[PDB]
Amino acid sequence: KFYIQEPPHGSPNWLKVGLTLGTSAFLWIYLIKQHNEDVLEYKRRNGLE
Amino acid sequence: VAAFLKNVWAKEPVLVASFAIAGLAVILPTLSPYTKYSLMINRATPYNYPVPLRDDGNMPDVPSHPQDPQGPSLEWLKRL
Amino acid sequence: DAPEKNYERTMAILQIESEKAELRLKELEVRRLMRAKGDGPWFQYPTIDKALIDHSPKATPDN
Amino acid sequence: MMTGRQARAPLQFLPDEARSLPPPKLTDPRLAYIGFLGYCSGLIDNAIRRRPVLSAGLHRQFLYITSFVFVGYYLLKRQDYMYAVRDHDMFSYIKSHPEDFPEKDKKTYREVFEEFHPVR
Amino acid sequence: LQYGPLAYILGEKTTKKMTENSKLITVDGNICSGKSKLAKEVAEKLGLKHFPEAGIHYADSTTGDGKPLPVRFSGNCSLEKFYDDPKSNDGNSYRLQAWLYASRLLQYADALEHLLSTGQGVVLERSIYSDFVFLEAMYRQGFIRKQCVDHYNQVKKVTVCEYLPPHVVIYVDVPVSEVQSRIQKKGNPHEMKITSAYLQDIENVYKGTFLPEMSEKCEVLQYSAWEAEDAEKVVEDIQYLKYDKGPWLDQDDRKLHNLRMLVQDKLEVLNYTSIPVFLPEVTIGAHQSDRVFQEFTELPGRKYRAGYNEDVGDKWIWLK
Amino acid sequence: MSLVYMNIMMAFTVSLTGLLMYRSHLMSSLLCLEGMMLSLFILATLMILNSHFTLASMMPIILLVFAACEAALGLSLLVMVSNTYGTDYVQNLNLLQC
Amino acid sequence: MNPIILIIILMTVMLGTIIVMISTHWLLIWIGFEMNMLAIIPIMMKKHNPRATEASTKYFLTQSTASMLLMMAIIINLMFSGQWTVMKLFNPMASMLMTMALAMKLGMAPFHFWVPEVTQGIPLSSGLILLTWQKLAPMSVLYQILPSINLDLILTLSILSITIGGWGGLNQTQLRKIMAYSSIAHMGWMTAVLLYNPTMTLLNLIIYIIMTSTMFTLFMANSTTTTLSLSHTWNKAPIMTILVLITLLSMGGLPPLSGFMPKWMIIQEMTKNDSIILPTLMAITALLNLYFYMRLTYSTALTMFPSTNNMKMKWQFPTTKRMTLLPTMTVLSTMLLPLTPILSILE
Amino acid sequence: MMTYIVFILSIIFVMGFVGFSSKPSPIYGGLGLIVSGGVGCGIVLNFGGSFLGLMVFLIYLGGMMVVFGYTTAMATEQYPEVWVSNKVVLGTFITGLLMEFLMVYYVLKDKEVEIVFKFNGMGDWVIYDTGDSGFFSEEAMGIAALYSYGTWLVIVTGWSLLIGVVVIMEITRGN
Amino acid sequence: AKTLLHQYWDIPEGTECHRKTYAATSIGGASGLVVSAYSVALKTPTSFLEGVARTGRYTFTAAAIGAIFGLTSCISAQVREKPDDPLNYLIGGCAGGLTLGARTRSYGIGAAACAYMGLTAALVKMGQLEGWKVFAEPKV
Ligand SMILES: CCCCCCCCCCCCCCCCCC(=O)OC[C@H](COP(=O)(O)OCCN)OC(=O)CCCCCCCCCCCCCCCCC
Ligand SMILES: Nc1ncnc2c1ncn2[C@@H]1O[C@H](COP(=O)(O)O)[C@@H](O)[C@H]1O
């Protein structure tokens, strides 16, 4: 123990860390799903398969 | 809820009567069978002229005279 | 790099950039003609919808 | 300019015809630059709150990068859509108006006379 | 963070905990009035939280490890060199007074933060409303200039207007001869160099300027030296007060919410202590400020924010 | 156009120049904004009642509403000027000149 | 202010701007402007001192006069067109009156006489609301009436705004008056390209709002309202001096920064229309804006003005402020020029 | 000259506007604005708007009573300027009246005039409808349609009046 | 006063010197009235006599600038026999700048206004020659 007062950022806010990692993982999987749907729709509308 | 109601009726009875009358005016037209007849009377009040139709040949619901049996009637307003 | 490589790469660069330059001149001329005449899909400033017009028989006949 | 195009279909970020176009790659250097902007935002965020800039908040830096890549992907889709619309309307207007765009006869330089201006 | 407008919206009203024990009490008096135990005695009768008098190193005691920093990082001043050379060329007198005013502003912010967050009253010693009497004694003794008084009045005019007075102000009548006797019995060799006229000017700005303007906005309790030795009589006089003056009565949830949003932000509390008034006593030049700031960054626990320091043992930094 | 629109637009311009030239008294010009609202009311209402565009007949009422809905605003801003200073003179409001 | 009332009043300011943006009827445009003014007056009087009351009085009088001229333009349009659609105006008199009304609401010169006064009188957050969010509804109406805007009028207003907003900020040491004359010059830049390509008007509006929101967020994060108090920032938080350096060099129109993006594109659209003199004078006159930006960078970042002793206490306390989107806006205001063809999304 | 009755009431309207626009004192400013708003409900009442004239009369009577109370409470001086006390009031009052009756003289002698727009000089009886509206006054039907058709207008107007009360109570606090 | 500049420019250079001088005098007088109106607007003169003195001073200053500009330009176009030539308006702009210096009673303002107003009048003549547009109509 060093600090004379318990700081606001002494421990990581595990709710906020969980929200951050869940939001980031959701945005990556939704981005990759959207891109796969977009390339499949491009290859369907142009017959480039 | 009854003790608070008695308290506000003892202290501010004008406001109790106000919220009671306002609550009735909110909820009670949705619980009346006569609210339909208000609209039916208002749309059966003939301000404009009933502009007639050119008889093409196939209009069985439109009469050729006001005293014909087909057409919209107002017997519901006469009886009520 | 070979002189062949630089030479034919320069020809590819010149094709791409001359096509872009001709398309920019076409783009300026198309913008000028569409603003002047108003018959293209651009510069279509809004007018009134005619679906808003009521064509019912009104109160007085002369309309 | 193109405001009358997007007036029959209002407030569409990406219309249906935008699906007839190739989407940007996930290795698009424009998208990699937007992800680099997300990483720089994470670094400035750790700098202004006096955190260690490279070590603190890797989840927060990663959500900065993820959020900028996610927004920038759709921004690049709408960018590529609007330039494809610009070219489509250009080519259709040139095709529907041949009298305004005559086919030029490019003369060779054996007939083209240019005045020589000597540098002496 | 912990408090904000959303906490105020979701039900945390700060008069739901404002009880009759929530009394901000400031004990005042001359240099050796014997108030130093008295305040603590009040804080062990009324169940209040005692704050010691803000020295140079009060901000050192609130931040970091609580240990006092070296004086070039906090203060750049010395009370003992003020006692030795009051008319010094380096301007230690007003520099010490300005640092003590900033420290008391910080202490009064800590007092109001405790009072508005926990509902426990705070017993202070010489708050910011009584800090000007030492400035005026130093100016009457010619220790400082008139520009120093104008700088202090500008800083006080733009800082004290946002705060409330205490509920109770306790003052201890000790004459100048008894103050000098307690200084001679104290044993501090620097403190024995205090002149009689400086003590007399402290007592004059007390009895002539401080108490006649504080008796309207709070409740004075002026005791002598022998009756301040018995804390039970003082606390008995506190518990039977009729709190009717001052602007604490017309404080709703909204005003105390705005005060609490000001008070918990310490850089907004200390915003106007460093106003750009270039005065030779307090203006530190560019190279010295750069050197002392870069030496302050290299201190343990001071290089980053208060939970982000590997050299003091902060873990899980990559998830914070 | 018709003869009455000359004088209603004339009254708008008279109230415009009365508003836009202050006589060092803020209430005397808050009357001029209310007069501009009156002139806009009568002008729009003459146009709407003339052409029998009946559905815009609710428009001047709405217009008139926002009239007092800013006029009251001005009066709520008149009393703060006349509490800082003993008068509502507009030349007391020159602190933001520096 | 009670935070529920603050939320409702800010949502009502936003509601007034949205009602201007989404409505097809002139009376609803006017209602949106009235609602916007009416709700933003207590944002200006958040502190209840005589300078906020003076600023609110001047703002009420200017915006009320502008709304009178706007409703007169609407009624003359009703006469000469028999309709209420928000589109081009069917009379040059109504066109002039509505252009004057919107120029007063933007604070464009020679109607600029309220923007440094009102911006200095109010806090930095309400000054941010004034200089960013209130520049969205008149720019909507100007975007919607550009087939009827007089060319000479909007170009005179534009270049007069650029010149007066350039010369005004040179004589200033207060940061809010600097940002207000910066506002005047930038609204001149936005409206000069309005009849040539209004996509560049929207581009300049968005880049300006990003840079101005960055600068006001930096001022609020440092709690600085004067030049000489901004000059103490190197002794307290030296990263903030770097951020105001890069943002003020961005606002001057220097490459490779994003504030060079609108200006250049505006020149790129005015030389297409065979106007060479006018964007040249505009570019040269923007050097005045760059000069007082460089004055602020000299006082803040590139040199070290002398600080005080009490700054040593503020070394021991970090910022607990909500610096909302400050790294995002700092990155977007400086490093967005390689993404310059993104402006096509504003078409 | 009775066919010119809306024109004559409009002359009295402009005279009231020159009366309060010269700004003598808000007592007499309220007087002149009551006179103008009371002949303006006679201008617009001769076009068919009997509901829509009585309301601009009544709302402005309440408004000028409030403005009277404030100019007796806040905007009061020891010697209020009646119409003629100041030379700058009387000068622009006479100026507005002479220019108004000048454009009266130029429009009855010539039967056409042009200030920015072009205006006729015939009596404005000429432009009325030669038909009847039946068993409804049409302006009453249009203002009645504020509840059936004007629902969004109701919502934004009632919200603006609600936040007008909230805004005014937030301004007139002082702290 | 769109027609003031038109009736200035609808006259061939070096033909009728009195009407050119009068037209440029009226252009200068309108500019001086605009400057006088804003000057009595934003900065309150101490009396009505002082206000009309400032108005007449600025109006006669700018009208004398316009008169000597048009006179010098048309006399130079007569004696040099080069009507479509910007050096005529360079000399005329320097004459107007010396006029402005003589009205401000100083030599440095005269030389600076000579240089910049001569360059400005030369650019105006070049714009009249090549058809330069400052308020250009939108074409694309
Ligand atoms: C849902 C239906 C529609 C309701 C909205 C429409 C209302 C129409 C009538 C207009 C009312 C406008 C004015 C209302 C003001 C209410 C707030 C108020 O005045 O609170 C204070 C009052 C006590 O007064 P006090 O604090 O002493 O004030 C100083 C002066 N003595 O506090 C009180 O008196 C207590 C107020 C709360 C308790 C009232 C309980 C009334 C119950 C009546 C029966 C149930 C009716 C149905 C609705 C549900 C009610 C909970
Ligand atoms: N503003 C001030 N200026 C100078 N000395 C002070 C100031 N405030 C407190 N002191 C000193 O702090 C000490 C307080 O005495 P004590 O009662 O022992 O706490 C005495 O030495 C005072 O002189």
XYZ file of C-alpha atoms in Angstrom, chain I:
140
model
C -25.615 52.477 -57.823
C -25.192 49.537 -60.116
C -26.081 52.040 -62.819
C -23.465 54.527 -61.573
C -20.649 52.140 -62.473
C -22.442 51.316 -65.735
C -22.688 54.965 -66.765
C -19.021 55.248 -65.842
C -18.018 52.277 -68.011
C -20.394 52.907 -70.947
C -18.173 55.771 -72.176
C -15.125 55.198 -74.422
C -11.806 56.097 -72.843
C -10.221 59.396 -73.805
C -13.310 60.873 -75.478
C -15.465 62.877 -73.028
C -13.421 63.891 -69.994
C -16.049 65.936 -68.139
C -18.658 63.169 -68.062
C -16.063 60.570 -66.998
C -14.893 62.907 -64.229
C -18.496 63.487 -63.119
C -19.320 59.760 -63.146
C -16.248 58.856 -61.092
C -17.056 61.816 -58.818
C -20.528 60.383 -58.212
C -19.081 56.899 -57.565
C -16.696 58.403 -55.020
C -19.529 60.411 -53.490
C -21.685 57.316 -53.020
C -18.738 55.470 -51.446
C -18.120 58.427 -49.139
C -21.787 58.516 -48.149
C -21.667 54.801 -47.262
C -18.508 55.309 -45.173
C -20.078 58.406 -43.573
C -23.284 56.525 -42.729
C -21.417 53.703 -41.004
C -19.112 56.256 -39.360
C -21.957 58.194 -37.750
C -23.599 54.843 -36.961
C -20.894 53.008 -35.060
C -19.072 56.036 -33.597
C -21.485 58.631 -32.250
C -20.556 62.210 -33.199
C -20.786 64.719 -30.377
C -23.369 66.882 -32.174
C -25.445 67.078 -35.334
C -23.059 69.720 -36.690
C -20.095 67.428 -36.005
C -21.962 64.567 -37.677
C -22.665 66.513 -40.851
C -19.082 67.831 -40.733
C -17.717 64.264 -40.706
C -20.218 63.296 -43.421
C -19.258 66.216 -45.658
C -15.554 65.672 -44.990
C -15.589 61.975 -45.924
C -17.917 62.611 -48.878
C -15.771 65.421 -50.296
C -12.627 63.344 -49.671
C -13.866 60.335 -51.626
C -15.485 62.525 -54.296
C -12.216 64.420 -54.804
C -10.441 61.055 -55.099
C -12.962 59.985 -57.737
C -12.780 63.302 -59.605
C -8.982 63.366 -59.804
C -8.951 59.643 -60.710
C -11.343 60.066 -63.633
C -9.681 63.306 -64.749
C -6.152 61.862 -64.666
C -7.210 58.611 -66.360
C -9.088 60.273 -69.215
C -6.434 62.971 -69.756
C -3.733 60.279 -69.870
C -5.816 58.257 -72.337
C -6.138 61.392 -74.479
C -2.467 62.391 -74.435
C -1.121 58.830 -74.768
C -3.673 57.681 -77.420
C -3.943 54.260 -75.730
C -7.494 53.877 -74.390
C -7.421 50.142 -73.569
C -4.296 50.430 -71.463
C -3.933 49.810 -67.698
C -1.043 52.283 -67.325
C -3.635 55.059 -67.667
C -5.467 53.742 -64.627
C -2.145 53.200 -62.833
C -1.448 56.931 -63.196
C -5.060 57.693 -62.258
C -4.886 55.501 -59.169
C -1.675 57.159 -58.054
C -3.354 60.544 -58.572
C -6.244 59.347 -56.411
C -3.781 58.113 -53.805
C -2.017 61.480 -53.722
C -5.486 63.032 -53.420
C -6.220 60.826 -50.402
C -2.863 61.794 -48.907
C -3.568 65.489 -49.453
C -6.956 65.053 -47.774
C -5.362 63.181 -44.853
C -2.576 65.847 -44.870
C 0.350 63.423 -44.969
C 2.896 62.175 -47.487
C 3.250 58.556 -46.372
C -0.468 57.811 -46.676
C -0.271 59.520 -50.064
C 2.559 57.294 -51.289
C 1.012 54.097 -49.896
C -2.391 54.927 -51.369
C -0.666 55.854 -54.653
C 0.942 52.407 -54.845
C -2.018 50.296 -53.761
C -4.794 52.291 -55.463
C -2.759 52.435 -58.673
C -2.321 48.661 -58.597
C -6.028 48.283 -57.777
C -7.187 50.537 -60.634
C -4.778 48.746 -62.982
C -6.301 45.401 -61.967
C -9.793 46.844 -62.512
C -8.815 47.894 -66.043
C -7.311 44.455 -66.730
C -10.528 42.897 -65.471
C -12.502 45.097 -67.839
C -10.201 44.003 -70.677
C -10.091 40.231 -70.165
C -13.555 39.984 -68.610
C -12.525 38.977 -65.101
C -15.369 38.059 -62.763
C -15.273 38.760 -59.047
C -18.945 37.852 -58.427
C -18.968 35.033 -60.954
C -22.227 33.324 -61.849
C -22.269 29.579 -61.041
C -21.747 27.589 -64.228
C -20.876 24.025 -63.165
